Swiss-Prot record:
It comes from the Eukaryota. It is found in: Nucleus; Cytoplasm; Chromosome. The gene is POLR2A. It is linked to Neurodevelopmental disorder with hypotonia and variable intellectual and behavioral abnormalities: An autosomal dominant neurodevelopmental disorder characterized by profound infantile-onset hypotonia, developmental delay with poor speech, delayed walking, and impaired intellectual development. Additional variable features include feeding difficulties, dysmorphic features, and visual defects. This is DNA-directed RNA polymerase II subunit RPB1.
Length: 50
DNA sequence: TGAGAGCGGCGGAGCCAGCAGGGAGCTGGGAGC
RNA sequence: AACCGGAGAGGGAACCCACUC
DNA sequence: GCTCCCAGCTCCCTGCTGGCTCCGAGTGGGTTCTGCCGCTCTCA
């Protein structure tokens, strides 16, 4: 991407569906999104149990 | 006194205790008589 | 011609990997 | 000699910095590891 690109494609918006598949940039961004939830699942338990 | 051997020794957050600095308040030395 | 069974040992520390959430 | 007002000492207070304890529940495997050098006394 060009420097200082605030457009939807350049910041994480995925305009494709899971039926049409994702472009490589959208695939990486989607991985970045899923990683956050996966981390919170492990972090949350240590607080809730305490 | 030499081999066998016994052992002698060489990360982060958040509550509690101490310290430092700063005033109100009391008592001796001087101000008037 | 003459009795003829029978057990008992494995423990701890540390580390890593993995699983279910 | 008399009462009294102003600085020096006593107290408490506030504020700040250093020190101790906690950090989900289960489960299954495997692997390594439990000290070592030598120094003096004894049997031969």
């Amino acid at each position: 991407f060009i420097k200082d690109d605030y457009g939807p494609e350049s910041r994480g918006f995925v305009e494709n569906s899971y039926l049409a598949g994702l472009t490589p940039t959208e695939f990486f961004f989607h991985a970045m999104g899923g990683r956050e939830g996966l981390i919170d699942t492990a972090v949350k338990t240590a607080e809730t149990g305490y």
